[PDB]
Amino acid sequence: RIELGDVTPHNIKQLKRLNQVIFPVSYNDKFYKDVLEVGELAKLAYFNDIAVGAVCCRVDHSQNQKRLYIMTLGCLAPYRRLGIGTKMLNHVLNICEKDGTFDNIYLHVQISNESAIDFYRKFGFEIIETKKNYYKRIEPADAHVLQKNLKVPSGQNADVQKTDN
C-alpha cells in the first residue's frame, strides 16, 4: 500500500534526504522553507510505511496565468514501478481539478529523461518548450518544459461557454 503524508518540520529533513538522492540538483534552505507553506501541494510518498518518494509543488502566476508548478516529483530508483508516481501526480491533479481556476500545470525535466517524458505524456502533458543550459553542471543541461492545459470553460451552459471550435 501507497500512502501520502504531509510535509511537517518533523519530516522535512527526510524529504531533503530523499530529494538529495533522487535528484542531482541541490535545493537551498529557502526551497524547503516554501514547501512547509504550500499545504497539500507537498507530500511524502510511503510504500509499506517506508518513505521512498516526494512531490513538491507551488502556485505560480507567470505568463499572466494561474499555473501549478511541479518543482520536484520522484521516487527512489527501486520504487519507480509501484504506481507511486501516479498516486503523487493524481493527488496534485485533484487539488487542481477541484479548484477549477488553473490555466495549466507545468514542470522542467532534462531532455534525455525519456521515462519521465513518457510518464507525463499519459496524463496529457506535452513538450511546449526547450531551454538550453537550464540546469548547471549536470549532463544534459538542456530542459524540456512539459505542460498540461487545465483551463475549463466558464459558463452555466453550452451557449455561454467559450472552447475549442
Binding site: 535528484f23 540538483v25 535545493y27 526551497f31 508548478y69 518543482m71 520536484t72 520522484g74 514542470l107 522542467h108 525535466v109 532534462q110 543550459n133 537550464y134 540546469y135 548547471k136 543541461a141 530542459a143
Partner: peptide, 4 residues
Amino acid sequence: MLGP
C-alpha cells in the same frame, strides 16, 4: 526537477 526545478533548476538550475
